[PDB]
Design a protein around this ligand. Structure first.
Ligand SMILES: Nc1ncnc2c1ncn2[C@@H]1O[C@H](COP(=O)(O)OP(=O)(O)OP(O)(O)=S)[C@@H](O)[C@H]1O
Lengths: 502, 288
């Protein structure tokens, strides 16, 4: 029908025509009204493609509706799922150059696609193969070109009083209280070349050992009760990841002879030994140590505030700075090329908890919008050795805190059956490419809201490039043909013939 | 005289433990007049789990029972240190503790008179109560929101069909925290004069009995067959001609049927003034 001097489309199905009325075909002037958006939203739109059957009508969507909430991208291998995300993320920037986009790239593909755009960054997770090599910083307003990048490790201070307990799993009698007493006292131990000790308020010192040697075993009690009730001297440097193993033993191999004077007994020491074994094992390794920095260094400003500032500083590196402050980059790409399938959940399901905690504090006055892109999320969104839903408590918190405090999520994947059905219910829009199996095409049925069956019964036969869209940003569903990105992502994984021919 | 308890299996004063601990069971030693804190459960648990009999005509602190009791003290400790649980719950004690043996039933019956109101005859200062829960996480809600509806049912029984005043309960997003005894308020409510309004979008996640104890129905658009089938399997007063309309309804239009409608109706609903906040988000503003 007409509104003022144009037309408008309304979806409601109870009307019908009268007998004798004449039937007429539709044109590219009415199709462009059936598949269009409002006028209120037109100056905030983004182009995605063209309609498949006819190919005379272009498709637009509104940034607000599309991204104020969470979004899902699904599809099998080799059908066009990585072109879509680069198209979208680059077209958001080219239109709103004051944006904030963060990308978790676990394959190293999404850097070749942002060549030619300002305020880009590129960080790799690990150590440099070479050592005496340089890395070149860039300035503001400079167009991104490859051959600029940086490296990074993650310290161990930024895992808290709880991450370490979870990572070590004290599963028997007398490991827990000792491992608590050690973490509570780690801020009063001093360090030298290769030995650990304490320093009293007045010069005197006393050594600690890790083998239960009886030398000077008579003053423990009174050199330990003080450390236990906050009486010894403090320090200002973070020690390494082995003072922990050195304290867990001298807190578990102590007793008292009925003859006054303490003794570092041998029986109790065995009740704690295995924790010492494993906490030693996690230093002579090539995987954990390549990513994490278990060496010890930095400031430890007093005030009982030495666990929080590490989190607060590690969050501002990946996710961004508070409002008002000056943040250099606007696009951040994180590369996890070198990261094992074993330490992925533990590490990548803690930065998100950090972000949740900090975003609860910043509030609505100090928080800045950001888009966060998560690739192959069926690898780290469910802690495998967390076999009860009592332990999946990260997405369920971050989604709500973000919906409240301006953080948007994009979830991309190719196996929606290895993914809980409450992750796929907090979404308000859906993009799906061809799915080949029949058990990954029921997990979507079971969990969708705003579709039907005639748009789902034509997903098994979608060609390469074509998709199907529905949700709260589309008036009626559409089958759509996506347009190619220039430049796109990389795909150089491996090819045999070449090497065999060399 | 006094005696001091610990949380760790230390050897200090592990001989005169049973002598002090048997009087505790036999209710022979002293009591107090103030509520203690929450963390103080782990010490009692550890002491009741790590005590054994010694050969030196005394008592001993074992370590083969700590390994049995350990998984519980752990969650207690990790729960008393969260920053999203203690800002809702008050884990500090300090209040008065009465005598007689009825100290739980006077704490329970003082938070119900604050949320759900007092009984008949007394003076209350409000007729409308709006509880806001924007600060409560999405993983602690089921427990704490089912606790309240389990507390509001042990008291209507002890109050009766005489001293009870009739109320109305508006429950929004009820499929998150409404699901034997966990749902007694939907069954034993008509006797104690309480009526529920349940608003929800996923009716397939409710119990077929809650969705059958309802007399009147208001249905807006509903696009999923997994939900239509439930509404139909539970429906009692209607037809199957108005079920086909529910999938093509616009906004503001509804289908209504039950006991207050002599023949089912399709309705267009009036707008409300002043309306609910129902604000939204806008990103283009902050960065443009
Ligand atoms: N509109 C289109 N028409 C024709 N081919 C396209 C179109 N869009 C993308 N393609 C092709 O699809 C091919 C493979 O897409 P990919 O980017 O490998 O998708 P993908 O494999 O699902 O992504 P991953 O999970 O990162 S391997 C590319 O070689 C593109 O040339």
């Amino acid at each position: 029908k007409r509104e003022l001097n144009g037309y408008v489309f309304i979806s409601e199905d109870w009307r019908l025509p009268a007998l004798g009325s004449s039937a007429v075909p539709l044109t590219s002037d009415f199709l462009n009204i059936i598949y269009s958006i409002d006028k209120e939203e037109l100056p905030k739109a983004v182009e995605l493609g063209v309609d498949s059957r006819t190919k005379t009508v272009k498709i637009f969507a509104s940034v607000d509706k599309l991204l104020s909430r969470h979004l899902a991208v699904l599809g099998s291998t080799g059908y066009g799922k990585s072109n879509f995300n680069a198209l979208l993320t680059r077209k958001v920037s080219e239109k709103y150059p004051n944006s904030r986009i963060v990308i978790f790239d676990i394959n190293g593909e999404y850097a070749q696609a942002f060549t030619g755009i300002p305020n880009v960054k590129h960080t790799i997770l690990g150590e440099s193969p070479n050592v005496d090599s340089l890395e070149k910083k860039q300035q503001k307003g400079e167009l991104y070109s490859e051959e600029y990048y940086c490296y990074k490790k993650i310290p161990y201070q930024a895992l808290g009083f709880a991450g370490l307990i979870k990572l070590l799993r004290p599963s028997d009698k007398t490991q827990l209280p000792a491992l608590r007493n050690a973490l509570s006292a780690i801020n009063r131990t001093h360090f030298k070349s290769r030995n650990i000790y304490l320093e009293k308020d007045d010069g005197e010192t006393f050594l600690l050992y890790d083998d239960c040697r009886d030398t000077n075993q008579s003053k423990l009690a009174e050199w330990l009760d003080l450390l236990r009730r906050r009486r010894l001297k403090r320090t200002n440097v973070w020690p390494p990841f082995k003072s922990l193993a050195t304290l867990v033993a001298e807190f578990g191999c102590v007793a008292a002879d009925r003859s006054n004077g303490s003794k570092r007994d041998a029986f109790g020491f065995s009740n704690v030994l295995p924790l010492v074994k494993i906490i030693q094992q996690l230093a002579e390794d090539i995987r954990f140590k390549s990513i994490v920095n278990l060496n010890g260094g930095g400031e430890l400003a007093d005030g009982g505030t030495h666990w929080d500032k590490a989190m607060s500083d590690e969050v501002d590196y990946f996710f961004g700075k508070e409002k008002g402050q000056e943040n250099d980059w606007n696009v951040h790409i994180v590369n996890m090329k070198n990261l094992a399938q074993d330490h992925a959940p533990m590490l990548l399901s803690a930065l998100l908890e950090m972000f949740a905690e900090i975003l609860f504090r910043r509030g609505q006055e100090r928080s800045y919008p950001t888009v966060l892109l998560l690739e192959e999320a069926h690898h780290y969104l469910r802690d495998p050795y967390a076999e009860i839903d009592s332990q999946i408590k990260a997405y369920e918190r971050l989604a709500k805190e973000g919906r409240k405090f301006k953080c948007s999520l994009i979830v991309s994947t190719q196996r929606p059956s290895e993914l809980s059905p409450t992750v796929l219910a907090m979404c308000s829009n859906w993009f799906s490419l061809r799915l080949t199996n029949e058990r990954d095409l029921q997990a979507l049925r079971y969990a969708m809201e705003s579709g039907n069956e005639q748009i789902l019964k034509q997903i098994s036969g979608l060609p390469r490039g074509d998709a199907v869209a529905f949700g709260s940003a589309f008036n009626l569903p559409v089958r759509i043909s996506i347009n190619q990105a220039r430049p796109g992502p990389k795909s150089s994984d491996a090819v045999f013939s070449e090497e065999w021919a060399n």
